[PDB]
């Protein structure tokens, strides 16, 4: 209960508009001089906190009751929820399988006499995802007490539902933030295909270049023929313009819209830089924006429901809205980071068949994909570790098993950038188990 | 906690550092003298003749009125009126700040 | 421009606590440390630095 | 909420706005007014439920 209540409690008033009008002498405020009740309109307009019970103007004994209650229905949405997938009730792990294309052989009937049953292995790679965030939204609704603040069940029930809606808002907003986290995380791991840009938030030339780079990128990403250069895997794939999305900070977005006319011309066009999702700024530093194929997100709902419990002593309900979800990111599907300022010469070397196995004495060809931020070809050095025997790898990435060990060999693709005194050894890694074979041998000749 | 009865003997103010003395068959309390180590902290105003209680418990930290501006990590001692002030003389240190406080604001403290 | 203090309206029972939050609508210049204080009748009764 | 004079300046000099002359996908529902009385107040952008 309150008593000494000001109408301007937390008001950091700049100037007294009422007096501005009162002392108006040919100034702008002369336009409000014709008003009849301006003094009151100003005095108790612009809001009003607390609530000081007002007596009736005609009969001061009587008080004026509240004519209308406005229970707000504002709902917040996850701008990224359009990237969500389905529900996963039972189970925890999701296996993502992606095949690949495989060369091309020449028609040759003569050769084909003996090559029937040639045997040609598929190029399949998989990724695993699993339930991650597991939280809940806790609220108390002491309904029986709330009832004294309402005069109708319509309003009463509306209020209660606003609380429930707030729970849903809480959940959906946090969902957003965790998906944002996925982006900064993937970035922090160097997994986006990076693009070097000059600080776009400077010269308009930088802004112009920024747009050109994004456009170039997008067209490559959707280039039907496929590409092996736009994801964290060596797989060849592609995107659709309507599936590409631009995750970008509203400030930069505005800079681009205004200064670059091409952007302005196609501000309303999803076939320009794909779909655009304007966000608040990224936690990562140089990460100015992300261009990404919707299938990059591997976000599945797991458990999510609202539990309730009645406190018979305190006459209230607790609501526990659980939200368990599988939030993750695919290394397949294309995704590009536009990084301002300093960048590494090489961001992330990728090695082909990351998970491989070979019979004792067999060989396996590997390929390294150097994700450089330039076209200087920083050279891959092939190496193998765990070799308890003379097992070794050729300079072309050809692993050759001794014929007897099995120690889950670590295949490395090393790219030394910068000076050798600070050898920035960017290393792509793969692992090879060795299947028993026990073929006759020891030394060739 | 372990509670016991004590009588104020000099207008105890909330969030002030307190000291005590042996009175007329009762522990009497008042604001701690300047530059020393306090025993109890007020959490209620108790006038000069008022009788109250003390709740005994090894509290990790106290919330008291800052007698001057306090920086995080500052070693604190009693000041004017039982307020807590920055110091550097170990023998008068009773705790230290874990948060910033301006004069007149509460400052959380950790006992030592 | 203005500083918004969290729960405009609180109801502390006595000896209880209430965390307040200031939303300083600065504009450009990133002003910082908000000085918390409280006015009342009985002495004591105060707000922490946070 | 913006006066016609500033609005005209923006329409002519800023091509992005000109291109989106009547688009609420660019800015909000541009409503032109006589002008703000308060000195320095050039424009305000508000929710319709304000």
């Amino acid at each position: 209960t309150f008593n000494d209540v000001k109408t301007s409690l937390g008001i950091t008033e700049s100037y007294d508009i009422v007096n501005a009008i009162r002392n108006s002498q040919g100034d702008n405020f002369k336009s409000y001089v014709p008003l009849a009740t301006a003094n009151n309109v100003a005095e108790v307009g612009a809001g009003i906190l607390i609530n000081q019970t007002v007596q009736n103007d005609f009969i001061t004994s009587l008080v004026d009751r509240i004519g209308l209650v406005v229970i707000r229905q504002v709902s917040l949405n996850n701008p990224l929820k359009k990237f969500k997938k389905g529900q996963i009730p039972l189970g925890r792990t999701i296996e993502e399988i992606y095949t690949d294309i495989t060369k091309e052989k020449q028609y040759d009937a003569e050769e084909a006499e003996q090559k029937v049953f040639e045997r040609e292995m598929p190029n399949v790679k998989t990724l695993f995802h699993e339930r991650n965030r597991q939280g809940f939204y806790h609220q108390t609704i002491q309904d029986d007490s709330l009832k004294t603040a309402f005069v109708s069940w319509g309003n009463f029930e509306s209020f209660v539902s606003s609380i429930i809606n707030a729970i849903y808002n809480s959940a959906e907003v946090d969902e957003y933030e965790y998906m944002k986290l996925l982006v900064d995380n993937y970035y922090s791991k160097g997994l986006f295909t990076t693009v070097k840009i000059d600080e776009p938030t400077s010269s308009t030339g930088a802004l112009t270049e920024f747009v050109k780079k994004m456009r170039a990128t997008a067209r490559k990403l959707t280039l039907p023929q496929g590409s092996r250069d736009w994801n964290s895997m060596a797989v060849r794939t592609r995107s659709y313009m309507e599936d590409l999305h631009l995750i970008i900070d509203a400030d930069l977005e505005a800079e681009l819209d205004v200064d670059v006319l091409a952007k302005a011309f196609n501000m309303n066009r999803t076939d320009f830089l794909g779909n655009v999702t304007v966000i608040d700024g990224f936690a990562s530093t140089g990460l100015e924006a992300v261009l990404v194929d919707k299938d990059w997100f591997m976000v599945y709902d797991n458990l999510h429901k609202m539990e309730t419990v009645r406190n018979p002593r305190g006459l209230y309900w607790n609501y526990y809205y659980h939200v368990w979800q599988t939030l993750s990111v695919s290394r397949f599907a294309n995704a590009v980071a536009f990084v301002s300022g300093d960048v590494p010469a090489v961001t992330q070397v990728i090695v082909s068949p990351n998970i491989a196995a070979v019979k004792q004495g067999g060989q396996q060809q590997f390929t390294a994909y150097v994700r450089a931020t330039n076209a200087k070809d920083h050279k891959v050095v092939w190496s193998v570790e765990g070799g308890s025997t003379g097992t070794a790898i050729t300079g072309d990435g050809l692993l050759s098993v001794s014929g007897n060990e099995d120690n889950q060999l670590t295949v490395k693709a090393t790219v030394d950038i910068g000076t050798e005194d600070k050898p920035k050894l960017v290393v792509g890694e793969a692992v090879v188990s060795i299947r028993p074979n026990n073929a006759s041998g020891g030394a060739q000749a | 906690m372990v509670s016991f009865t004590a009588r104020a003997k000099s207008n105890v103010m909330a969030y002030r550092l307190l000291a005590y003395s042996q009175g007329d068959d009762i522990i009497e309390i008042s604001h701690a003298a300047e530059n020393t180590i306090p025993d109890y902290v007020a959490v209620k105003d108790v006038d000069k003749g008022d009788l109250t209680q003390v709740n005994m418990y090894p509290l990790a930290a106290w919330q008291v009125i800052a007698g001057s501006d306090i920086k995080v990590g500052d070693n604190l001692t009693t000041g004017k009126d039982g307020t807590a002030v920055p110091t550097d003389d170990p023998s008068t240190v009773f705790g230290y700040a874990v948060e910033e406080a301006q004069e007149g604001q509460l400052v959380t403290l950790v006992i030592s």
Side-chain angles (χ1 to χ4, degrees), chain A, chain B:
Chain A
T1 300
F2 298 93
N3 59 351
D4 184 353
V5 177
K6 296 183 290 183
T7 61
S8 59
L9 177 61
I11 304 301
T12 58
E13 185 182 79
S14 179
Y15 64 91
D16 184 358
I17 193 169
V18 173
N19 193 38
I21 294 167
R22 179 170 64 180
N23 294 340
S24 174
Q25 292 287 273
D27 66 15
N28 289 343
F29 292 98
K30 70 187 179 182
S31 65
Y32 300 127
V33 171
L35 298 178
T37 58
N39 289 345
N40 289 339
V41 171
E43 178 66 24
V44 295
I48 293 299
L49 299 176
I50 309 300
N51 183 6
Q52 183 175 10
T53 301
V54 177
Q55 288 79 341
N56 185 267
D57 288 341
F58 182 63
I59 301 173
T60 57
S61 294
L62 298 177
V63 298
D64 289 318
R65 294 179 65 178
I66 296 170
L68 177 67
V69 178
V70 179
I71 300 169
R72 295 291 190 168
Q73 302 298 304
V74 174
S75 179
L76 304 179
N77 289 116
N78 180 357
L80 302 177
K81 70 182 179 181
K82 298 298 184 180
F83 298 115
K84 293 176 69 176
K85 302 295 184 181
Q87 307 293 301
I88 304 295
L90 301 177
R92 182 178 180 187
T93 298
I94 300 171
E95 179 177 355
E96 183 183 10
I97 298 173
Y98 183 42
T99 66
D100 203 334
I101 63 169
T102 304
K103 301 182 181 178
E104 169 52 343
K105 297 178 194 285
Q106 184 175 3
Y107 178 86
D108 184 341
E110 181 181 359
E111 180 179 357
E113 289 173 329
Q114 297 297 304
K115 299 298 182 70
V116 176
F117 307 112
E118 178 182 1
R119 185 173 174 82
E120 180 67 64
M121 298 296 99
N123 292 287
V124 177
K125 296 181 182 65
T126 65
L127 299 170
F128 300 88
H129 307 280
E130 64 181 356
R131 183 187 65 195
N132 287 328
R133 74 172 298 205
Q134 294 169 72
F136 62 90
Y137 297 87
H138 177 203
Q139 289 286 266
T140 298
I141 302 179
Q142 188 174 314
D143 55 359
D144 286 338
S145 293
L146 289 172
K147 289 174 182 173
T148 62
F150 296 93
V151 298
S152 176
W153 288 101
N155 289 338
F156 175 80
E157 291 296 316
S158 294
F159 175 69
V160 171
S161 72
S162 75
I163 294 169
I164 297 302
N165 287 339
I167 291 169
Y168 294 152
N169 285 338
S170 298
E172 191 163 347
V173 171
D174 288 344
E175 184 183 72
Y176 164 76
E177 190 66 22
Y178 281 107
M179 291 178 71
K180 185 184 178 186
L181 179 60
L182 291 172
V183 173
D184 280 308
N185 187 35
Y186 190 87
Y187 178 74
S188 73
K189 293 181 177 289
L191 298 177
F192 283 113
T193 301
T194 60
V195 177
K196 183 181 183 180
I197 64 173
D198 291 344
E199 180 181 354
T201 54
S202 69
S203 175
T204 61
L207 291 172
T208 300
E209 291 296 315
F210 182 76
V211 172
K212 288 192 289 182
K213 289 175 179 176
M214 290 190 294
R215 178 63 172 171
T217 299
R219 297 292 275 157
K220 290 179 181 178
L221 293 176
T222 62
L223 182 63
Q225 73 184 60
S227 178
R228 295 184 183 281
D229 293 320
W230 299 113
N231 61 74
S232 294
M233 305 293 286
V235 302
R236 189 183 187 95
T237 189
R238 69 174 295 265
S239 298
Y240 294 80
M241 288 299 296
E242 62 276 28
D243 295 337
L244 293 178
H245 293 75
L246 177 63
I247 308 302
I248 186 167
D249 184 332
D251 286 335
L252 179 58
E253 177 66 11
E255 290 291 317
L256 296 170
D257 287 343
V258 175
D259 290 347
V260 180
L261 291 176
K263 183 67 165 65
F265 290 173
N266 290 279
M267 181 276 284
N268 298 286
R269 295 289 295 145
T270 60
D271 295 332
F272 178 45
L273 296 171
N275 298 337
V276 179
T277 300
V278 176
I279 62 166
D280 60 90
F282 292 106
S284 297
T285 60
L287 181 61
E288 296 301 339
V290 177
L291 178 62
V292 60
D293 184 315
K294 73 182 181 72
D295 289 337
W296 184 83
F297 289 90
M298 295 296 287
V299 179
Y300 292 76
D301 288 333
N302 291 114
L303 179 66
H304 62 93
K305 62 180 177 179
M306 183 178 286
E307 297 276 319
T308 65
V309 60
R310 177 72 168 174
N311 182 327
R313 186 179 185 101
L315 299 174
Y316 63 79
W317 290 91
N318 285 341
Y319 297 83
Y320 293 103
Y321 182 55
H322 289 75
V323 181
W324 293 3
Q325 297 180 298
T326 297
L327 271 71
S328 187
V329 174
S330 180
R331 296 183 187 189
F332 297 124
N334 299 310
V336 178
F338 294 86
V339 180
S340 65
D342 290 348
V343 300
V346 178
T347 299
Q348 177 65 62
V349 175
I350 298 168
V351 179
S352 71
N354 283 327
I355 303 171
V358 63
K359 291 178 178 174
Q360 291 171 316
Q363 299 185 330
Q364 178 66 58
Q365 180 68 57
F366 294 98
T367 302
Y369 301 83
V370 179
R371 299 302 187 205
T373 59
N374 61 44
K376 301 298 183 181
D377 192 16
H378 294 289
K379 304 302 184 187
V380 175
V381 179
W382 289 102
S383 179
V384 59
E385 297 180 5
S388 68
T389 68
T391 298
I393 185 165
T394 70
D396 293 334
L398 179 62
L399 183 65
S400 182
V401 175
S402 62
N404 61 358
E405 75 176 300
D406 185 7
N407 292 287
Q408 298 181 47
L409 298 173
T410 299
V411 177
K412 293 184 175 181
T414 300
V415 179
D416 183 348
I417 62 174
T419 180
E420 68 279 38
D421 291 341
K422 300 295 181 181
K424 296 178 182 179
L425 303 178
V426 177
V427 178
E429 300 180 303
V431 62
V432 180
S433 67
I434 300 170
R435 186 183 298 275
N437 189 24
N438 297 315
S440 176
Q444 290 180 330
Chain B
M1 298 186 179
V2 179
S3 297
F4 68 89
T5 300
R7 184 174 65 196
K9 66 178 184 179
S10 180
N11 298 328
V12 173
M13 298 179 72
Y15 309 113
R16 272 69 174 182
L17 298 172
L18 303 176
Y20 74 95
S21 67
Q22 183 176 47
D24 187 8
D25 294 327
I26 190 165
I27 294 171
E28 293 181 347
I29 62 172
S30 70
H31 293 186
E34 186 179 5
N35 296 320
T36 190
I37 298 173
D39 296 302
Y40 183 88
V41 59
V43 295
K44 184 184 285 187
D45 289 356
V46 181
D47 290 345
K48 182 178 178 180
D50 288 343
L51 181 66
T52 189
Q53 295 189 313
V54 178
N55 297 319
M56 299 301 295
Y57 185 89
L59 292 170
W62 294 354
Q63 296 184 315
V64 300
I65 300 298
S68 71
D69 292 349
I70 299 172
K71 179 176 173 181
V72 175
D74 285 348
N75 291 328
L76 304 176
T77 190
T78 62
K80 300 293 186 186
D81 300 324
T83 61
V85 298
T87 189
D88 61 4
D89 180 338
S91 68
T92 61
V93 176
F94 70 89
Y96 65 91
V98 298
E99 65 181 0
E100 177 182 349
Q102 299 291 307
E103 182 177 355
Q105 296 182 323
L106 292 173
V107 61
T108 306
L109 295 174
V110 172
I111 307 302
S112 298

